Design a protein around this ligand. Structure first.
Ligand SMILES: O=C(O[C@H]1CN2CCC1CC2)C(O)(c1ccccc1)c1ccccc1
Length: 380
């Protein structure tokens, strides 16, 4: 069985590495070739995808070589470079999530000052500062500590951070590098979700979303289920007042036009409901296209939930995939035999799995990312 276990580990490991590489490369290229995806959020996500790509290329394969062979066969120099690269990339990831969390925090708490300062240059210099700071914090201590103490205690065939010979040092470093950032991101997101928890955006977003549901419906249930809620949010959006210019009275021509547009909209919605009841569901979908026509005909009267959802998904992926290894670091301070080598391998592999899961958290949930993906994969 042991031979089959080795073959199985090599196969699933190469599969994970390949999926990670392909996904993150698709994200990076998609941002680089589509100017509609060249936003600050996707700059942060670009850096995150770069870190995930480095994890998928270097860390995964070399760790598989390590585990499968049973010792470190490459050498001390390559071991030092691999450790330094992995920890610098990990730290850059952590501070990247910190940058995303704080950026969203200032977006939701300072709308009058921060959005105007939120350009691609500021994001670029923040990302660059994150990478440089990570490299300065991690690289010299990993590469040259052996020269500082004057002896290399990493014996032949081993690969580990030398100054992590002490368990308490490793745990303290895990507090400075993992626990405090996770707490900070948790509090920041707490303020995000409490900030999002105004009405006009919810009604309009509901109406448009249900319109898209009617357009892409498969059976006779989704069309009506989106029709009734879309009409409810339509009337609730008609009763309220949008941000009108000059603050006009309810008897003004602008308000009367605003109500009239939703009158026509509800009328055509009821026509689509009629045609949906007679058995002409296809004509009800075309009638939904008509709803889009009149909606865009009267859309000048109008002008974040999915962004908060996406951020939460990324944060939860990181925390859930990275918590076991760090609690193994916590337990290792008082009982080293309590964590076998296999469990260490499992924690390492969850940390690496974070990079494979990341693209599915923000790219497979965005329409522009999907369209750019299919453009990249189609044969020209
Ligand atoms: O979990 C951690 O690192 C993971 C990333 N790499 C190296 C060690 C593990 C698994 C793979 C991390 O909490 C950690 C690990 C060991 C000791 C101290 C901290 C960490 C490391 C660098 C930057 C941010 C966090």
């Amino acid at each position: 069985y042991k031979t089959f276990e080795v073959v199985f580990i090599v196969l699933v490991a190469g599969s994970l590495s390949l999926v990670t590489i392909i996904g993150n490369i698709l994200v990076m290229v998609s941002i680089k070739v589509n100017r509609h995806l060249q936003t600050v959020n996707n700059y942060f996500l670009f850096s995150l995808a770069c870190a995930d790509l480095i994890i998928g290329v270097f860390s995964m394969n070399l760790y598989t070589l390590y585990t499968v062979i049973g010792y470190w066969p490459l050498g001390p120099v390559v071991c030092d470079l691999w450790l330094a690269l992995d920890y610098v990339v990990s730290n850059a990831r952590v501070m990247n999530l910190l940058i995303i969390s704080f950026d969203r925090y200032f977006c939701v708490t300072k709308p009058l000052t921060y959005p105007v300062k939120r350009t691609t240059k500021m994001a670029g210099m923040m990302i660059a500062a994150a990478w440089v700071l990570s490299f300065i914090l991690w690289a010299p201590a990993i590469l040259f500590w052996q020269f500082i103490v004057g002896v290399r205690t990493v014996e032949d065939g081993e690969c580990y951070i030398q100054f992590f010979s002490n368990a308490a040092v490793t745990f303290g470093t895990a507090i400075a590098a993992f626990y405090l950032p996770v707490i900070i991101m948790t509090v920041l997101y707490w303020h995000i979700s409490r900030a999002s928890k105004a009405d006009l955006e919810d009604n309009w977003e509901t109406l448009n979303d249900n319109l898209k549901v009617i357009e892409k419906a498969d059976n006779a249930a989704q069309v009506k289920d989106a029709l009734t809620k879309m009409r409810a949010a339509a009337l609730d959006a008609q009763k309220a007042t949008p941000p009108k210019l000059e603050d006009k009275s309810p008897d003004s021509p602008e308000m009367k036009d605003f109500r009239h547009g939703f009158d026509i909209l509800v009328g055509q919605i009821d026509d689509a409901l009629k045609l949906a009841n007679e058995g002409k569901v296809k004509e009800a979908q075309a009638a939904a296209e008509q709803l889009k026509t009149t909606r865009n005909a009267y859309i000048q009267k109008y002008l974040e939930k999915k962004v908060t959802r996406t951020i939460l998904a990324i944060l939860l992926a990181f925390i859930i995939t990275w918590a076991p290894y760090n609690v193994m670091v916590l337990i290792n301070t008082f009982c080293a035999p309590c964590i076998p080598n296999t469990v260490w391998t499992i924690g390492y592999w969850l940390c690496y799995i974070n990079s494979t899961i990341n693209p599915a958290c923000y790219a497979l949930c965005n329409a522009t990312f999907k369209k750019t993906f299919k453009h990249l994969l189609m044969c020209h």
